[PDB]
Structures are given as C-alpha cells and as structure tokens.
Amino acid sequence: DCSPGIWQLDCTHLEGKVILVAVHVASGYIEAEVIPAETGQETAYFLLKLAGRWPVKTVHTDNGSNFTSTTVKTACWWAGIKQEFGIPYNPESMNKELKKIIGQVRDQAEHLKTAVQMAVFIHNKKRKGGGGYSAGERIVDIIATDIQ
Amino acid sequence: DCSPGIWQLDCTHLEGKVILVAVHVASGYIEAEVIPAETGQETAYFLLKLAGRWPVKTVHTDNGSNFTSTTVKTACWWAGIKQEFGIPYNPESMNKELKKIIGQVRDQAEHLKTAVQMAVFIHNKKRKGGGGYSAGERIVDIIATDIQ
Ligand SMILES: Cc1nc2ccc(Br)cc2c(-c2ccc(Cl)cc2)c1[C@H](OC(C)(C)C)C(=O)O
Ligand SMILES: Cc1nc2ccc(Br)cc2c(-c2ccc(Cl)cc2)c1[C@H](OC(C)(C)C)C(=O)O
Ligand SMILES: [As]
Ligand SMILES: [As]
Ligand SMILES: [As]
Ligand SMILES: [As]
User: Fold this and answer.
1) Rounded to a whole number, what is the largest CA-CA distance in chain A?
2) Sign of torsion, CA B133 B3 B7 A21?
3) A53, A111, A126, A141: which to substitute to probe chain B, counting the most B Cβ within 10 Å?
4) Whole-angstrom Cα distance, residue B99 to residue B13?
C-alpha cells in the first residue's frame, strides 16, 4: 500500500509507564521503547535513532501535539524528516496486538521494558501466513526493492 | 564476505560514559546506544532489542567475558542467538570512525547520547562510493537477498 518511508509514531501507557511505538506503515514492522516520560526530548531522541537505521522520510501520529516542540522539530530538521499529511484521521491498530503480546509474555520478565522487546520480537517474526512473510521480512523486502 | 546473521558487539568509553556498538559484519551497518554502565543486564537488554529487529543468529565480541553472565546467556537463549566462533581474535575497526564522527558533531548536541545517534546516522547513510552503496542500503540488500 503505502510509500516505504512512512512511519507512524505513538505513545501508549502500561503499568504507569510510557511506551513509544513506531510502525513502518507499509510492512507492519515495529520498533518500540519504554520511555520514562511522554516528553518532546524523548520523542526527538527516538526520532534520531529511528532515522539513523531506516530511510525515514515522513512520520504520522494520532496526536499532532506530540510534534509541536522545537526540540522535536529540530530532530526532524536535522534528520530530514517531514511530518506526514496524506494519512487523515478518523475521530492499524497494531498497538492493540503489541498490548496483547505483552500481556502474554509479561511474567517472563521483571521489567515491562524487557516484556516490550519480547513482544516486538514476537510481532516482527510472526509469519502472517497467507505468501506468508513476517513484518521483519516485509520491511526489508520493501526497502530493498525501493533501492533496486 | 560473512554470513548475514553475524553481528559484532563491543563497548567503548567516552566522556566517562559507555557506548554499546553493534556492527552487522557483512554490511558495516551499526546500531549503538549510550548505556549508563558496562553490565550484563544492559547487554542482555540490548541483545533482545537487536534480535527483535534483524535476524540475529550469531554475535561476536572482542571481550568474551562480556557474555558470561546468566543474564546475557538467558537473552541469547530466548532470542535463539549463538555466540560466534568463526571469527578468531588478533592480539574492523568501524569503532574508530564512529569515534571520529562523534567528535565532528559533538558540539551540535548537549548530550553524548544525541551526538552518538547523529554519528550512527551519518555512518549508515555515508555513500561508500566505488557501486557506491551506504551501509544502511547494504544491510537491507544482504538480508533481502538472503530471504529471496
Ligand atoms: C532484570 C533481569 N534480571 C535477570 C536476572 C537473572 C537472569 Br538469569 C535473568 C534476568 C533477566 C532476564 C529476563 C528475561 C530474559 Cl529473556 C533475559 C534476562 C532480567 C530482565 O531484565 C533485563 C533483560 C534488563 C536484564 C527482566 O526484565 O527480567
Ligand atoms: C537536550 C536537548 N535540548 C534541546 C533543547 C532545545 C532544542 Br531546539 C533542541 C534540543 C536538543 C536537540 C539537539 C540536536 C537535535 Cl538534532 C535535536 C534536539 C537536545 C538534544 O537532546 C535530545 C535529542 C535528547 C532532546 C541534545 O543532546 O542537545
Ligand atoms: As508520544
Ligand atoms: As517531524
Ligand atoms: As560491552
Ligand atoms: As550469546
């Protein structure tokens, strides 16, 4: 479906903590991290990290206020990210599933942050089996083809 | 050169802090993070995170003691990682370069951790221009081909 440089980024809450989830919209691949607080600095830093790893051209969010601080706009400026406008908003979600996966592994770990990376791993390696690729395989296929 | 599932993982120090650098040996692509201390818990957690994102089968290090705690061995156990034995050790380095890149951007950021992600970004997007791919492009080409 979508252009290969579009990501969605949102926060969810669990155990009084904050989880920042990035989804590569064309593949369903996710990167996620437990942040100590839902702040502009945390998002800017996560954006730098994400952009260093994948070719990130536009990012969408379901809370536009998330991207208004100069701190975040400076990270996008530096990394060359645009904020996406082609996905409008209805008053996905691969955020519910990652909440279901976390509950399922929650007791395998003391910290939520560990349970989260467990769930990311399971999500990205899960064979979405129809011709049955995982999201980890799909992102790589999509970005590689878009190069070659 | 190398199998597409081999990574090298090491720590370096800067500004009294610790930087954990993972290199995808076949492509030169790096992921790096500033950790508060050089501990088994930090490495296990980083391993979970790395394995959720790329198909990681073996990891090498230049300090074998790094991987001896049960904490780390449990992360590899869970993620299905083997510790690599096919790269022997002479009594790379893409660790020096990332130290050169950091110095070059150091004043663009208050925190070292920010400067580090800046340097990762520059390193991975740098056109190694001979037929002139970047490490970010090469990793994706290598893993995709190894699927298809
Ligand atoms: C705090 C912790 N302590 C441990 C102590 C001994 C052992 Br054996 C494993 C862990 C693990 C542990 C748990 C699961 C896996 Cl797969 C690997 C290590 C954790 C996990 O935290 C990290 C990964 C940050 C170290 C956790 O959240 O429970
Ligand atoms: C602490 C900090 N405060 C800021 C305050 C205002 C503005 Br405008 C930018 C920053 C940036 C800043 C610097 C560079 C870029 Cl590219 C984006 C934001 C940082 C950087 O830290 C992060 C990314 C964690 C917020 C830094 O280390 O200096
Ligand atoms: As958020
Ligand atoms: As932006
Ligand atoms: As280390
Ligand atoms: As291991």
Assistant:
1) 44
2) positive
3) A53
4) 10
Joined together, the tokens standing for residue B112 give 């070292």
Contacts of A53 in chain B (CB under 8 A): 31, 120, 124, 136
Separation CA A119–CA A100 (nearest Å): 9
Kindly compute the dihedral angle of the four CA atoms of residues B86, B53, B100, B6, in this order, to the nearest 10 degrees. 10
Q: How far is the CA of A46 from the centre of ligand 3 (A)?
A: 10
* Residue B8, H or E segment: strand B6-14
Which amino acid makes up residue B33? E
Instruction: Look at ligand 3, atom 1, and give the residue with the nearest C-alpha.
Output: A11
Closest to A25 (Cα-Cα) out of A66, A67, A59: A59
Backbone angles phi, psi at B44, to 5 degrees: -65, -45
CA distance, residue B2 to nearest chain A CA (Å): 19
Domains of chain A (ranges; CATH) run 1-148 (3.30.420.10)
Task: Please tell me whether the peptide bond between A69 and the residue prior to it is cis, using omega within 30 degrees of 0.
Answer: no
The answer to whether A18 touches A36, Cβ cutoff 8 Å, is yes
- Single-letter amino acid code for the residue at A137: E
When CB atoms are compared, the residue of B51, B54, B121 closest to A79 is B121
Contact predicate A20/A43, CB 8 Å: yes
Q: In angstroms, rounded to a whole number, what is the distance separating the alpha carbons of residues A73 and B146?
A: 37
Pairing of strands A82-83, A58-60: parallel
DSSP 8-state symbol, B15 = T
Three-state SS at B116: helix
Element (H, E) at B75: helix B70-79
Resolution to 1 decimal place, in Å: 2.2
**Would strands B6-14 and B17-24 be described as parallel, antiparallel, or unpaired?**
antiparallel
- What is the distance between the alpha carbons of residues A135 and A54, in angstroms, rounded to a whole number? 14
CB atoms within 10 A of CB A33: 19
Give the separation between CA A123 and CA A57, rounded to whole angstroms. 24
